[PDB]
Amino acid sequence: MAVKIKLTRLGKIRNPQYRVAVADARTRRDGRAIEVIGRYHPKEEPSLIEINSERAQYWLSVGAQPTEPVLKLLKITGDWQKFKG
Amino acid sequence: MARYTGPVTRKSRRLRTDLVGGDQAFEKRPYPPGQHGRARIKESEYLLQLQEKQKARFTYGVMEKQFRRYYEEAVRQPGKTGEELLKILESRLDNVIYRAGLARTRRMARQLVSHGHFNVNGVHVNVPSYRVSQYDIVDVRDKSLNTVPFQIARETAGERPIPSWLQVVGERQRVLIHQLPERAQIDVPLTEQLIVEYYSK
Amino acid sequence: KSQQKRNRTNERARLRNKAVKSSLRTAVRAFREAAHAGDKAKAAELLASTNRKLDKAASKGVIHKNQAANKKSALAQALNKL
């Protein structure tokens, strides 16, 4: 039971978006997220990122473990690299 | 949830007024809707208000179930609900085209729109009921050229004075809305309050 | 189903655990007997083995050490009484 960062599929069927959130691995796809930090869209803008990039450093400092796509988003923002720097 | 699709005389005479007309100014007939219509009739607020609601319904060609949606919106909005209803109805695509005079009848205007003869800013739309805002420019479909009802329609555009809240280019018929569609300030051929009260009872 | 290994290994674990626990309680019995007789020195030696047995098991995960705390602390006080 460890805190991870998941991408929650929300909205309508064929044009959904992904809510960015910190959550325990033992939760469901749409559970009571600990705190939501931004959003993501797969359409319109190529890899549309809308991330606060403020608390990520905190939650990572606690030890939150993001998944693959989350790492990619963090790298596009530079938050992964800036945090690790 | 669909078009009336029938004779106009049955409702224009029932409501005792030529709602639109068409090629003929009006049927040049009396005021008995049907068989026994020549007899006098007793009035009610329900009859009267109902008739007024029907006048808007057929004037614009919208069915009840959608009309109540617009009603709901008008009630939600501040200002006189009737005036809000008319303005909302004026944002209708078919309405601004009809008021631009680009078709013999409103029915003709809606058919053309429903078949995409008049697109929008960038979309080949086919929705009579589309809400047209400020700077929501109509694009005349390129495929609609080499046909009748845009060139001949342009030539006959004078039959429908352009609403003061918008400007039609004519050369491109870029129906450009500048101000809000305050039809309440112009050419209102029927009541609104009676309708507003009617839907409350 | 094909997960009977879960059962078998549970059997081994519980078997050794409760065997150990019985041995612990046996030692406790001896200590308490030393308290009744008054052989404090023997009780001290047995308490030392208890220290090398009780916490040894706790380090093997038998308990979460709270039982060790209650038992060693309380009985050390009991020995302080006698």
Next chain:
RNA sequence: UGGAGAGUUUGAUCCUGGCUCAGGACGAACGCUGGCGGCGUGCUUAACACAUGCAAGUCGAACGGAAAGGUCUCUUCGGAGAUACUCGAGUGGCGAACGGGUGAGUAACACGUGGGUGAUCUGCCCUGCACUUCGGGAUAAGCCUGGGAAACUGGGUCUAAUACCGGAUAGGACCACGGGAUGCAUGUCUUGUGGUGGAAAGCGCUUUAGCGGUGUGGGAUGAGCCCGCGGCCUAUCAGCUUGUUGGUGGGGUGACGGCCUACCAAGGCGACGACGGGUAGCCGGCCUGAGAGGGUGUCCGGCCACACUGGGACUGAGAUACGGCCCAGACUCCUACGGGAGGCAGCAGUGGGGAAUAUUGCACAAUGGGCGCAAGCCUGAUGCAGCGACGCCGCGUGGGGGAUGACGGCCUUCGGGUUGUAAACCUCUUUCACCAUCGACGAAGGUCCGGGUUCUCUCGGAUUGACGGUAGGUGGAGAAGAAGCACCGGCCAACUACGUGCCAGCAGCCGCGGUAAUACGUAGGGUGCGAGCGUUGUCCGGAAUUACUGGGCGUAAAGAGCUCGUAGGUGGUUUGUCGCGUUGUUCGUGAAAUCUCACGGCUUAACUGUGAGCGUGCGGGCGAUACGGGCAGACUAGAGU
């Protein structure tokens, strides 16, 4: 920027006060008809039983090991050599307690909300520190072997290990004494004294890139414990209570705790509803309503319980745990009859039940979860599809010309009217169906390339989109190809006649029909809505007919036969006080979604999305003290003597 009423007692009126209707809503059944798309929902009845197939497997970078494919070698040329990529099977490690489903039971333990949780835990994550050593023995697997029909099992051989076991080779920490800094919140930090332990490992590999491993500090998560307040009916249940109430001591527990338990005391609850019965999963929220409130709590989301029935426990960081064991019991099944096996209230599916509720669908692309260094594996959850107009939203079912006052119908004062310019006919367009055709976003990842030692961040290419020829797009043909349903005395838009003749028959209330029915059957006419329309059923309102907002009790039903007086309620003038109540401020709280508003995106809408608002409400902290209230006290008219 937010509430309408009518009909309905009498010869007539006015009041009082019942019935009904007009609206909306539904997880919806039925009827008639029936085009499409988009978006959503789909046992509400027997927590009744169940075939089929599938739902949790993974790790060779832990080890033994070689039952396969394939490799390499051998070589019988159809058998060998684990050499090894790989790997059946197996030991060991993770998880298997999440996830999925249902709501029987539960009457407040739960739920909600908010507080406490100083002797409440908290493995897998991050992080600082220290450790990261020395050894033994056995054994599964394998081989031989016994049993039984099978299930399934004994015995003997044989073997390693991040398995087991014993040495500390940490002394943070555990214990006790004493001490120091610092608590009232039943005490936290820190030093000394005595005792005092624990693991860990080694690994394969990129042949050292990496994987690791142990005790701790504190974080973080999650969970547990306790508690205030709130959220059904019943008094035709008022006496409930000896493990009960309280203490001592002891054990036990992750833990305070009659949790348990020896002894002692005799209490405790209760009309400011005990015990008991009935009914029920709770909430965010859904519906109604002007709102206050009512009803409801189905999908979705959170929380709680249950898993053929009942009971108990292990493993474990953490179980009531659908796919785990054991017992008991029921019900099915097998058998060599000896003896055994099973649990769809998980997806789909069957049967039953009933008015009724779906495909034995495709796949794991993204997302999601687990193991593993990773690649990779699994995933009937999520993601997509199929059925019903099952329900919302949205578009068509042609326009222009078009008095022939066509045909025809109906009525007719029978001259005429009406149907009706509607049709016929001329003309132009084609959304969508049909046909053809191109074929996406949703997509990042994986391989590979280049830059990059490992990393990083990146070039290019490859592949990977199940749903998919997807949709969308382009072109073609021609009004071709797609309108019905209910009602029509009034209430209530909505009628003329025929037939009929208290009969038949209609009806929500009044009610109609006793040979001239505007109320029955038919035609025609008209109205309303529209691939939906009507009926039934249910909830609200309308109903101010349970009335706080917002009603009554002289006769309309209603003032106890009267008095007393307990609890409870309520309580004059007033000083000063407390600031409990209330008010104002501030912090936290009040999740998200949903709702309002404003923007924005799906061709619009519905819908989704953004943001604000809303979140009416609690605690904490901050000022005043009016009024209320409490305390202290006074006067006097109240009342009394």
